[PDB]
Amino acid sequence: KWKLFKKIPKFLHSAKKF
């Protein structure tokens, strides 16, 4: 149970801006 297991792959969130 690691809150990071669902936070590292946030590369898709970067493009969400542009």
Curated annotation (Swiss-Prot):
This is Magainin-2. The chain holds residues 223 to 232 of 303 of the full protein.
